[PDB]
C-alpha cells in the first residue's frame, strides 16, 4: 500500500547453506539497508547497534539488533538489550524473533521490525533519511516495553570516511555522536514484577552498523569497543586483533571529534607516536591498576582495569590527544568459553575518561566493551 523497498526475512526461509555475497559498502552512507538482501549465509551476520550513557548518573542502555543464523536453534533473529541503572542494578535479555523486516518508506525513513506474531511481541528501529535521529520501540509484553530516542549532535557526520575494519568486516557509524533518551518497563523472568528505567540526563550515545560474511572467530581474537563524549571531545573506537594464526596488524575504525569537528580519522593501530606519521593513528594499551579504589576488571582472564587511548594526527606537526579510560562499573559479563581460570569472555563497561591535548583534563563517561574469543 505504498512505494517501499523491502528486505523481509524469516528464520525458517532466509538462512542459506551455500555461500552468499553481500551487496557492496555504500561510501558516504549509513548503509542502513541490509547487505544480505534475500538470504544470509550460516557464518554471516548483520548488526544495528544503539547505546547511550548518562553523564549525570551513569545509567546506560545498549541495544544489539542482529541478523544471523546462531539464533536459529532459539526460534529467530536475536535482539540483545542491556541496561544498567544509576545505582548499578542491571537487566538483560536475549530476545528471538522469527521475522525481521527492514524497509525504506516513501519519506526515506528506514524501518527495521523484529516481530514474533504468536507472542504479540516486536522490537523496531527507525532511522530518519538524513540520520538526524533514530528511535526504537520496545513492545514485548511481560518482558520489555518502552522507547529510546537518539538525536544527532551538530557537526561532521564522519560518514565520508573509510569503514573497513580489516579485510572481512565493515564498521559504519550512522550516528557517531548523539544525545539519547530512553524509558522502559523491565520485567522479571517470571513476569510477576516490573521495574521502571529512565536513562539519566545529559546522555550521549550513537548508532553503529556492522556486518561481515565471516563468523566472529574468523575475523578476530579480541575486540574493544568505546564511545564517549569528553567535554568538547567525542570519540568512537572499535579495535580488533586478527584471528588466531593470522599475522595481520590489528585493525581499527576509530574517530575523534572536537566541538563536532572530525579531527582524527584513525584506520591504523600503532604502539608509538612516530610509528606511522603518514596516517592518523591510534594507540590503545591496556592498564592494570588493581590497587586503585574506583576500578573494576572483567570477570574472566583479562584483568585489565582500563585503557590508555591516544589519537596521533598525521604529520610531523600533528596534534596528539591522550585519554585515560578507567573501567568503573560492569554492565555485563558473558562467557566465550567453558568456566575456568583461563576462561575468556565478553564484558560491557561503564567507562570514566579524562584527557585531551597537553594541558587539558576534560572528563566524561562512556560505554566500553571487550570480548576475547577462544
Amino acid at each position: 500500500m505504498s512505494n517501499v523497498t523491502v528486505s523481509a526475512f524469516t528464520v525458517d526461509k532466509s538462512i542459506s547453506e551455500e555461500h552468499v555475497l553481500p551487496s557492496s559498502f555504500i561510501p558516504g552512507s549509513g548503509n542502513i539497508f541490509p547487505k544480505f538482501t534475500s538470504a544470509i549465509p550460516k557464518t554471516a551476520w548483520e548488526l544495528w547497534y544503539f547505546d547511550g550513557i548518562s553523564k549525570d548518573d551513569k545509567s546506560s542502555i545498549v541495544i544489539g539488533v542482529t541478523r544471523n543464523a546462531e539464533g536459529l536453534k532459539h526460534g529467530g533473529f536475536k535482539v540483545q538489550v542491556f541496561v544498567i541503572w544509576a545505582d548499578e542494578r542491571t537487566w538483560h535479555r536475549d530476545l528471538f524473533f522469527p521475522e525481521s523486516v527492514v524497509s525504506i518508506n516513501e519519506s526515506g525513513v528506514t524501518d527495521g521490525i523484529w516481530k514474533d506474531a504468536t507472542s504479540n511481541s516486536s522490537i523496531s528501529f527507525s532511522c530518519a533519511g538524513d540520520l538526524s535521529k533514530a528511535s526504537l520501540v520496545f513492545d514485548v509484553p511481560g518482558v520489555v516495553q518502552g522507547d529510546m530516542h537518539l538525536e544527532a549532535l551538530p557537526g561532521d557526520t564522519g560518514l565520508d570516511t573509510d569503514a573497513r575494519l580489516g579485510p572481512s568486516v565493515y564498521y559504519v557509524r550512522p550516528i557517531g555522536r548523539a544525545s539519547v533518551k530512553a524509558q522502559l518497563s523491565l520485567y522479571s523472568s517470571d513476569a510477576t514484577a516490573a521495574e521502571q528505567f529512565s536513562l539519566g540526563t545529559s546522555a550521549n550515545g550513537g548508532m553503529d552498523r556492522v556486518w561481515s560474511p565471516l563468523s566472529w572467530p574468523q575475523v578476530m581474537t579480541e575486540s574493544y569497543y568505546l564511545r564517549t563524549q569528553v567535554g568538547p571531545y567525542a570519540m568512537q573506537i572499535m579495535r580488533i586483533f586478527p584471528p588466531a594464526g593470522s599475522e595481520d596488524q590489528p585493525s581499527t575504525m576509530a574517530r575523534l571529534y572536537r566541538e563536532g569537528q572530525l579531527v582524527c580519522v584513525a584506520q591504523h593501530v600503532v604502539t608509538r607516536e612516530d610509528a606511522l606519521m603518514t596516517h592518523d593513528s591510534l594507540i590503545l594499551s591496556k592498564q592494570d591498576n588493581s590497587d586503585s579504589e574506583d576500578v573494576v576488571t572483567g570477570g574472566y582472564r583479562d584483568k585489565n582495569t582500563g585503557y590508555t587511548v591516544e589519537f596521533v594526527e598525521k604529520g610531523n606537526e600533528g596534534q596528539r590527544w591522550k585519554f585515560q579510560v578507567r573501567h568503573e562499573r560492569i554492565i555485563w559479563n558473558t562467557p566465550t568459553s567453558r568456566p575456568g581460570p583461563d576462561a575468556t569472555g565478553n564484558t560491557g563497561f561503564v567507562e570514566v575518561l579524562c584527557g585531551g591535548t597537553i594541558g587539558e583534563s576534560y572528563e566524561g563517561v562512556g560505554t566500553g566493551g571487550q570480548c576475547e574469543l577462544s
Side-chain angles (χ1 to χ4, degrees):
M1 65 155 306
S2 68
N3 179 40
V4 69
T5 310
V6 185
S7 167
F9 276 23
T10 67
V11 76
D12 292 321
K13 325 284 158 50
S14 311
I15 310 279
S16 168
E17 283 220 337
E18 295 151 330
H19 95 268
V20 178
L21 291 158
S23 314
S24 55
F25 160 71
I26 308 165
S29 165
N31 290 259
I32 312 298
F33 199 84
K35 323 304 291 191
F36 303 89
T37 50
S38 56
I40 195 158
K42 291 175 184 167
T43 56
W45 49 272
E46 300 221 55
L47 172 63
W48 295 256
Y49 177 90
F50 313 80
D51 72 15
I53 177 177
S54 168
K55 186 188 171 80
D56 176 63
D57 70 20
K58 285 150 176 184
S59 57
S60 175
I61 179 171
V62 175
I63 312 304
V65 181
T66 76
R67 277 171 173 189
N68 62 75
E70 82 176 41
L72 190 42
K73 69 163 183 292
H74 290 282
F77 306 105
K78 183 178 64 184
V79 178
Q80 299 194 109
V81 180
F82 305 84
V83 320
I84 182 165
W85 277 266
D87 67 4
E88 294 183 47
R89 286 181 305 119
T90 50
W91 185 97
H92 170 46
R93 290 291 197 286
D94 287 347
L95 302 176
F96 297 93
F97 301 86
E99 285 178 279
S100 164
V101 179
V102 182
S103 57
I104 305 178
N105 76 3
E106 302 187 348
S107 296
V109 174
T110 310
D111 296 308
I113 305 185
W114 273 233
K115 36 183 178 174
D116 172 43
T118 59
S119 83
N120 199 26
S121 300
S122 75
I123 293 181
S124 78
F125 68 79
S126 186
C127 296
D130 61 11
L131 297 177
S132 57
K133 63 184 164 180
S135 59
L136 295 85
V137 168
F138 304 85
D139 190 9
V140 190
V143 184
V144 52
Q145 294 178 330
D147 63 354
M148 173 179 180
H149 301 271
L150 300 83
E151 296 269 1
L153 290 176
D156 292 327
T157 70
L159 281 176
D160 60 328
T161 62
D162 180 8
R164 286 169 306 172
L165 176 66
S168 320
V169 176
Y170 273 101
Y171 201 113
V172 184
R173 304 182 180 275
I175 299 172
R177 310 162 298 109
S179 62
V180 187
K181 296 175 181 179
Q183 304 276 349
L184 296 182
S185 288
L186 299 174
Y187 283 84
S188 65
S189 54
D190 67 15
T192 59
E195 282 280 324
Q196 189 165 82
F197 175 84
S198 313
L199 184 62
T201 60
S202 307
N204 297 79
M207 175 191 181
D208 296 331
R209 173 80 171 98
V210 193
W211 70 90
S212 176
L214 279 45
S215 75
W216 271 10
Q218 289 171 302
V219 311
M220 77 182 197
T221 56
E222 174 180 351
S223 56
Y224 181 62
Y225 166 105
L226 170 77
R227 190 189 240 87
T228 178
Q229 180 83 32
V230 185
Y233 294 107
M235 70 196 75
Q236 313 94 43
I237 297 186
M238 171 57 55
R239 184 278 279 117
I240 58 171
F241 294 112
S246 172
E247 271 178 342
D248 295 340
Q249 304 283 345
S251 310
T252 192
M253 199 294 193
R255 304 286 185 266
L256 179 64
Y257 300 73
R258 189 189 209 284
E259 308 177 82
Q261 182 181 325
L262 182 53
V263 296
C264 204
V265 179
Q267 289 298 113
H268 296 83
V269 179
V270 301
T271 65
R272 217 195 174 195
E273 293 189 348
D274 60 6
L276 187 67
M277 291 178 63
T278 47
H279 292 277
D280 292 348
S281 282
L282 166 77
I283 303 174
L284 182 68
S285 42
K286 302 182 188 185
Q287 312 289 116
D288 191 327
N289 303 290
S290 20
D291 50 83
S292 296
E293 298 181 4
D294 50 353
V295 79
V296 296
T297 80
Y300 309 95
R301 76 176 180 198
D302 192 341
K303 296 343 252 183
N304 84 68
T305 62
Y307 294 78
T308 299
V309 165
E310 177 166 16
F311 288 94
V312 181
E313 190 179 22
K314 66 182 65 60
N316 295 310
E317 73 293 1
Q319 301 178 87
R320 281 96 172 89
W321 305 266
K322 192 179 190 191
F323 301 92
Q324 295 298 355
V325 184
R326 160 169 62 83
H327 307 318
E328 198 186 83
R329 319 175 172 198
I330 295 304
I331 311 186
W332 72 77
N333 263 318
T334 62
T336 60
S337 73
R338 300 199 124 172
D342 198 56
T344 54
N346 184 326
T347 301
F349 294 104
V350 164
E351 317 279 39
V352 172
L353 294 92
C354 185
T357 61
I358 54 83
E360 296 175 337
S361 45
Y362 296 104
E363 295 198 343
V365 309
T367 40
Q370 73 195 9
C371 179
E372 189 180 18
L373 299 185
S374 292

